[PDB]
Amino acid sequence: TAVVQRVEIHKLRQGENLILGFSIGGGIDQDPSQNPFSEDKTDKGIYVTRVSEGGPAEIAGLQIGDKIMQVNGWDMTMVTHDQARKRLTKRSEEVVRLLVTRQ
């Protein structure tokens, strides 16, 4: 029911920032019952909740609803929302590889 995908996002510079062109929800500090994208409503994982049309994530193949398992090898299955955000937005990293699962 879930298929593994590997995407390689090349961030886009927007002013001082490097951006990925998507949004995330979830995390072990959040209420998993409110995540509309998961199969199991106790799943506290990080999910892609929106993708910017024409942005880096879209070009790389990311899709709304994808569950993020790893970012550049870092486990994303049991992290807080803020930890996930920080891992995805390291200013020093222009390329981020995401391991995701897709229903």
């Binding site: 995330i24 959040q30 209420d31 409110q34």
Partner: peptide, 9 residues
């Protein structure tokens, strides 16, 4: 959803 915060990155 107010109870499903999301972050833009």
């Amino acid at each position: 959803n107010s109870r499903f915060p999301t972050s833009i990155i």
